[PDB]
Structure 1
Amino acid sequence: KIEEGKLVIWINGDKGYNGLAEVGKKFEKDTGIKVTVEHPDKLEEKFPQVAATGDGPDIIFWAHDRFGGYAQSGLLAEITPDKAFQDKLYPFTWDAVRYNGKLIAYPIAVEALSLIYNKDLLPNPPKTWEEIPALDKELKAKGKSALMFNLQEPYFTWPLIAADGGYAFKYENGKYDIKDVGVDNAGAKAGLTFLVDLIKNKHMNADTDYSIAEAAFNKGETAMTINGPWAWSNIDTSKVNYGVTVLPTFKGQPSKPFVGVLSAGINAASPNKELAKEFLENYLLTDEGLEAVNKDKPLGAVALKSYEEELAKDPRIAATMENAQKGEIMPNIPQMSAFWYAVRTAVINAASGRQTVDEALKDLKEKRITNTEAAIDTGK
């Protein structure tokens, strides 16, 4: 059971959890309540099974896409901020994190992937994916690579896949249709085919993960990488001279990155619901609170209007918001969990040569997605 008179927060390791501890200590200073920030492995998978026990954290921090699934399972406490508080944050930020015509979590900040490039050895970055192969050959002669990024997570390869009209679930107007899937259309296949072509011709390695790709760019071994605002902190200290720019276009069409919204939800089992609300509204979601977190590891464009006006001057955040405009907001429906688990396998198998592109994306749409939806509905 969860301890009453205490707050336990979970947040992913790539975020600024040490900054969240500072606001935690300032909270303990004022209220006498010990805040314990944690960042366990696979917390998005760990939360639901533990929340249904047994119970885990009081607050859970993750992008909005998974929260609608949590809310369906009755895991999240219903929040009630008044309109005075809602006006402090951006309206479209509240729209993401709204499920079933109801608010389920406090949104913190919005985040979208951008092309991060080393401007000392690549002063003129490529505007197209199509230019990268030839650029890689020029750099390989110098003993370096053109592009490296996490291929093990489909969040990073989605931008290219969606560039020519690849989508997850087709909307109508303020709705989504789970029967209508866009992961096996001309645009999705073309996007993935070009990516696997980069692998086939040794311009990028299929086993490249987050850690390896980050190491490569920050050590100065690759010219470009694709990542969000959270990664900027480590590049600053690495002293690599870099810039943040619009993602490469494919067939003249801009890449469409799935835009996320870091949001904090209160556990339904938590006996510290008031303290949770007290912490988030009055300590975290303030200029002072977001500074602490943002200084540790950047959040990107934040939901709080007052503080966002300050950050908007920074050209990195303009480039993040430019990539978000071209991209589109993630759905927050419960099926996004099964979607992500299914697409992940499909992309990996295609990149490893286990399946061909057409085989993987056909299997994804036809069989894999539905099997995954059945897996989580029953016990697994």
Structure 2
Amino acid sequence: KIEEGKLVIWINGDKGYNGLAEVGKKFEKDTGIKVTVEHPDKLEEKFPQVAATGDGPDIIFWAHDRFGGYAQSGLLAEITPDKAFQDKLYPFTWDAVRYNGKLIAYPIAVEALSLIYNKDLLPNPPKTWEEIPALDKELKAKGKSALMFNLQEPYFTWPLIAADGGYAFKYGDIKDVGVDNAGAKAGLTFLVDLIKNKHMNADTDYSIAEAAFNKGETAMTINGPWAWSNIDTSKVNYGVTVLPTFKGQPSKPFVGVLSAGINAASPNKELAKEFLENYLLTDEGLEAVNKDKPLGAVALKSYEEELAKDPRIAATAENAAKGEIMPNIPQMSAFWYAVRTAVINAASGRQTVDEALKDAQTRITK
């Protein structure tokens, strides 16, 4: 099964696995324990198959949303950091790793959508959604549009739909979803109106929105940190800020937390805890991973205050703190399917905000 006296770590190849490997050697030279870092493909799929037979890595890195399912099968060890350490990280990053009331992973990085704007076309971006319809009319007078973002994926529209009262699964509880409540309806209605008044096209997807923004056709777009590299090479003078409010309340973008779990079958749990708590989750450890490939916003308060010197990271973290934690539970799949259909049928008059959303509520509660 899992070897004793060492650490095998799994993380995705699109991360700073080389940087994490450096943090490992730093551990080796300090204990004599070899830390092997691997980045298998479909690792999010291989874990539940190797761990089930008592095998696999000691530590697995991945987005928090898949961890609920791992802990459901008892593949994850309940971690136990003391109050002192828990305080070194942002409180909300911890709610992302709580399952059935217990902590099942350490939060590493934070991710969330932000409002991106062309500083040349829009010196002062709108603080609210309600002021966007008007703004678009002004920009139309010059041949430019106000906003353009992916409308096909609920992941991009959820921020608005949930701004006022809207929410996925109630914190923990699965029989309590806020998809067809008054808030979600108000938000989706405002979204559909923008499409009806021609302020936005119902066929706008990711590629179209990105092209429009980079070619300088539209003033704003909603995207994540993974999109910045594209805009940089576009030269366009852009900025990243907090998302607009809707009816006085903040937009609720889903939050993704890159988490580090400990294999339940691992005989090196104490070592894993040592590595993660005193070697990785430190300003030096994270700065070694971030240098390889940026993590975005981090859960470690001390280091995050250092990364926030970037606008873009600071905006990411602000939007996240106000966001909603992606459904950690396994019932997540239904939600995405249900909401996606609703927004689409709602946008193309196939159904009304009431019908669409109501059908989505049942589909998820079943």
TM-score (norm 1): 0.74
Shift of 1:106: 1.2
Higher mean C-alpha displacement, 354-363 vs 329-338: 329-338
Given that residues 70 and 76 in structure 1 are in contact (C-alpha distance below 8 angstroms), is that contact kept between their aligned partners in structure 2?
yes
Contact 2:152/2:205 (8 A) holds in 1: yes
Please report how far the alpha carbon of residue 184 of structure 1 lies from its aligned counterpart in structure 2 after TM superposition: 0.8
Distance 1:252 1:379 in 2: 29
The whole-number CA distance in structure 2 between the counterparts of 1:218 and 1:36 is 40
Q: Could you list the per-position Cα deviations for residues 14-69 of structure 1 after superposition, in whole angstroms to 9, with x for gaps in the alignment?
A: 76566556656767888899978777887667754675579766544344344223
1:377 corresponding residue in structure 2: 363
1:112-261 matches, within 5 Å, as: 112-140=112-140, 142-170=142-170, 177-261=173-257
Quickly say closer, same or farther: Cα 1:319–1:277, change in 2 above 3 A: same
Change (3 A) 1:73 1:214: farther
Counterpart contact for 2:167–2:324, Cα < 8 Å: no
Task: Decide whether the 8 Å contact of 2:177 with 2:365 is kept in 1.
Answer: no
Q: Relative to structure 1, is the Cα distance of residues 118 and 168 closer, same or farther in structure 2, using a 3 angstrom cutoff?
A: same
Change (3 A) 1:53 1:229: same
Looking at structure 2, the residues matched to 376 and 212 of structure 1 have their Cα atoms a distance apart, in angstroms, of: 32
**Kindly tell me: are residues 276 and 182 of structure 1, through their superposed partners in 2, closer, same or farther at Cα, counting changes over 3 Å?**
same
Q: 1:377 to 1:189 in 2, by over 3 A?
A: closer
Whole-angstrom distance in 2 between the partners of 1:238 and 1:17:
28
CA distance in 1, matches of 2:100, 2:192: 38
Q: Distance in 2 between matches of 1:28 and 1:219?
A: 49
The alpha carbon displacement at 1:84 in A equals 5.6
Distance in 2 of aligned mates of 1:375 and 1:127: 30
How far, CA to CA, are the matches of 2:361 and 2:58 in structure 1? 27
CA contact (8 A) 2:335 2:364 kept: no
Task: Give the superposed CA RMSD.
Answer: 4.5
CA distance in 1: counterparts of 2:201 and 2:42, whole angstroms: 24
1:299 aligns with 2:273: no
Q: Give the Å deviation of 1:183.
A: 0.8
Contact between 1:230 and 1:298, CA under 8 Å: does it hold in 2?
no
* In structure 1, C-alpha distance between the alignment counterparts of 2:357 and 2:205, rounded to whole Å: 21
Task: Find the aligned partners of 1:209 and 1:15 in 2 and give their Cα distance.
Answer: 26
Structure 1 residues 38 and 246: alpha-carbon distance in aligned structure 2, compared to 1, 3 A threshold: same
Alignment length, in residue pairs? Answer: 365
Q: Structure 2 stretches of 5 or more lacking a match?
A: none
TM-superposed deviation, 1:119: 0.6
Post-superposition offset of 1:13: 7.5
> Is residue 149–residue 222 contact of structure 2 (8 Å, CA) maintained in 1?
yes
Range 292-301 or range 192-201, more displaced: 292-301
**Which secondary structure does the structure 2 equivalent of 1:262 belong to?**
strand
Residue 252 of structure 2 aligns to a residue whose secondary structure is: coil
Question: Is the alpha carbon distance of 1:90 and 1:141 closer, same or farther for their aligned partners in structure 2, counting shifts above 3 Å?
Answer: closer
Q: 1:159: how far off? A: 1.4
**SS of the counterpart of 1:226?**
strand
Taking structure 1 as reference, are residues 132 and 288 closer, same or farther at Cα in structure 2, changes over 3 Å only?
A: same
Partner deviation per Cα, 1:346-367 (whole Å, 9 max, x = no partner): 334434555443222111xxxx
Q: For 2:89 and 2:299, how far apart are their aligned partners in 1? A: 5
Q: Deviations over 1:188-246 (max 9, x none)?
A: 11211222333344443445444554454345443212233444454445433222222
Q: Is the 8 A contact 1:14 1:231 kept in 2?
A: no
Moved more, 71-80 or 10-19: 10-19
Secondary structure of 2:131's aligned partner: helix
Distance 1:122 1:377, change over 3 A: closer
Does the 8 A contact of 1:346 with 1:361 survive in 2? yes
Cα shift at 1:168: 2.1
Q: CA offset at residue 81 of structure 1?
A: 4.2
- The percentage of aligned residue pairs carrying the same residue is 98
Instruction: Tell me, yes or no, if the aligned pair for 1:93 and 1:261 is still in contact at 8 Å.
Output: yes
Describe the shift of the 1:160–1:290 C-alpha distance in structure 2 as closer, same or farther (beyond 3 A): same
For the Cα contact (< 8 Å) 1:77–1:267, is it kept in 2? Answer: yes
**1:21–1:37: 8 Å Cα contact kept in structure 2?**
yes
Secondary structure at the residue paired with 1:129?
coil
* Structure 1 unaligned blocks of 5 or more: 172-176, 364-373
The DSSP-based 3-state class of the residue aligned with 2:243 is coil
CA deviations over 1:123-163 (Å, ceiling 9, x no partner): 12222323333434544565544323333432321111112
Alignment check: 8 A CA contact 2:54 2:265 kept:
no
Give the Å deviation of 1:286.
Answer: 2.1
**How many angstroms apart in 1 are the aligned matches of 2:352 and 2:135?**
26
Contact kept in structure 1, 2:175 and 2:365, CA below 8 Å: no
Equivalent residues of 1:118, 1:242 under 8 A apart: yes
Contact 1:233 1:297 in 2 (8 A): no
